[PDB]
């Protein structure tokens, strides 16, 4: 009924890929075969494989001798190996479940991205866009980060209205992206505007005060 | 078993009708699904069997089919209808995909508001400088950016990313950021990005002195 995908974001060429799929509210012994399906970044899907409610599994021939799928049934888990990784096996990870009565892939998971690469992971540096000049559009810069992603919130999420998030891009072997927010000329610089820009995959958070001149 | 879905993208007003269609490569006696996906959402189970509709999706919907050839249809779109959508063959393993059909809200035109802003003095101590321009909540999404510093359209160091389609506006947003040296940005003073959209005869232009 609920399944929730877990695992590591990032993983090197010629390692395993290891993912977790935790399910509640229905018995993985119980009905149901039990599937990875992935979706590269160019958006395509390809179905993996699935192991069956009594343990029997089917593979994807396009991954034959790479994958398995296990479980384990006192934690209502079941498992991804993907052996010997390469960067194309970078996509979003999906489980999903299936019904041999009907047919389709009824529930599925939020997914998890995983990246292959050998780069390492590096917290953002943020820096501020204001307007030089001599409504304001603000924003904040945030460069130079590997994996993806990150997430601005502008003045702890307060002010909604008006923001945009761009989506990042690759540049020599890190990411940048940015963050614009416009607010009335009112409250700028009159009330502080700050970006808070949070990194998951480096545990950190750094906050960048917007000054004018 | 391959699936061919066509178009790969599609732009309709809303109340409009879309017509998404699915070949697959063999007879697949209606094991067909169609799923839609929103942005940073799972694939949702839209029609299974070829033709039957799934809770939570109103009769705007319909799957149709036999044989090899396969159809989705919204009768009229609306806005929560935009993603991609996606059909699947269930007839024989491995289980096939087609490669999705992006759909799209075509609204009326919409004038990007152009910011720019210089380096920060924090970026420009680390040795680099990075030009932003932001293109907000325009429609449609084709627009041209071209950098000009002291006067000379510059392409090498240009970085642009749009947004989705904004789900409330339908408009895009984009930023245009040109990444330069300190030294090479220090050494010339004006900057300017200017954006050419349908919106306006003459480019939309924002630019900045380093001289003020």
């Known amino acids: 009924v609920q399944l929730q995908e877990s695992g590591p974001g990032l993983v090197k060429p010629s390692q395993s890929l290891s993912l977790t799929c935790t399910v509640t509210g229905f018995s993985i012994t119980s009905d149901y075969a039990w599937n990875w399906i992935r979706q590269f970044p160019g958006k395509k899907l390809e179905w993996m494989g699935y192991i069956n409610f009594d343990g029997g599994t089917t593979y994807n021939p396009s991954l034959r001798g790479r994958i398995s799928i296990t479980r384990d049934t006192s934690k209502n888990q079941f498992f991804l190996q993907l052996r010997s990784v390469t960067p194309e096996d970078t996509a979003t990870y999906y489980c999903?479940?299936?019904?041999?009565?009907?047919?389709?892939?009824?529930?599925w998971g939020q997914g998890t991205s995983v990246t292959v690469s050998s780069a390492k992971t590096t917290p953002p540096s943020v820096y501020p866009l204001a307007p030089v000049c001599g409504s304001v559009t603000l924003g904040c810069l945030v460069k130079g980060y590997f994996p993806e992603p990150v997430t601005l919130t502008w003045n702890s999420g307060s002010l909604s209205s008006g923001v945009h998030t761009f989506p990042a891009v690759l540049q020599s072997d890190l990411y940048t992206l940015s963050s614009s927010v416009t607010v009335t000329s009112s409250t700028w610089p009159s009330q502080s505007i700050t970006c808070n820009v949070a990194h998951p995959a480096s545990s950190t958070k750094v906050d960048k005060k917007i000054e004018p001149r | 078993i391959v699936l061919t879905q066509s178009p790969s993208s599609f732009s309709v007003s809303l109340g409009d009708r879309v017509t998404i269609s699915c070949k697959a490569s063999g007879y697949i006696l209606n094991r067909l699904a169609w799923y839609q996906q929103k942005p940073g959402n799972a694939p949702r189970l839209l029609i299974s069997?070829?033709?039957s509709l799934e809770t939570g999706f109103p009769s705007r919907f319909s799957g149709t089919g036999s044989g090899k050839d396969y159809t989705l249809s919204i009768s009229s779109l609306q806005t929560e209808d935009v993603g991609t959508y996606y059909c699947?063959?269930?007839?024989?393993?491995?289980?096939?995909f087609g490669g999705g059909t992006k759909l799209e809200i075509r609204r009326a035109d919409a004038a990007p508001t152009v910011s720019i802003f210089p380096p920060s003095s924090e970026q420009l101590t680390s040795g680099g400088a990075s030009v932003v321009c932001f293109l907000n909540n325009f429609y449609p999404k084709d627009i041209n950016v071209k950098w000009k510093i002291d006067g000379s359209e510059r392409q090498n160091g240009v970085l642009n990313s749009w947004t989705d389609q904004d789900s409330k506006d339908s408009t895009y947003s984009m930023s245009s950021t040109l990444t330069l040296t300190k030294d090479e940005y220090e050494r010339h003073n004006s900057y300017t990005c200017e954006a050419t959209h349908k919106t306006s005869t003459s480019p939309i232009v924002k630019s900045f002195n380093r001289n003020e």
């Open positions: 699947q063959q269930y007839w024989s393993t491995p289980w096939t």
């Open positions: 999903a479940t299936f019904y041999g009565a009907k047919g389709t892939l009824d529930y």
């Open positions: 069997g070829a033709t």
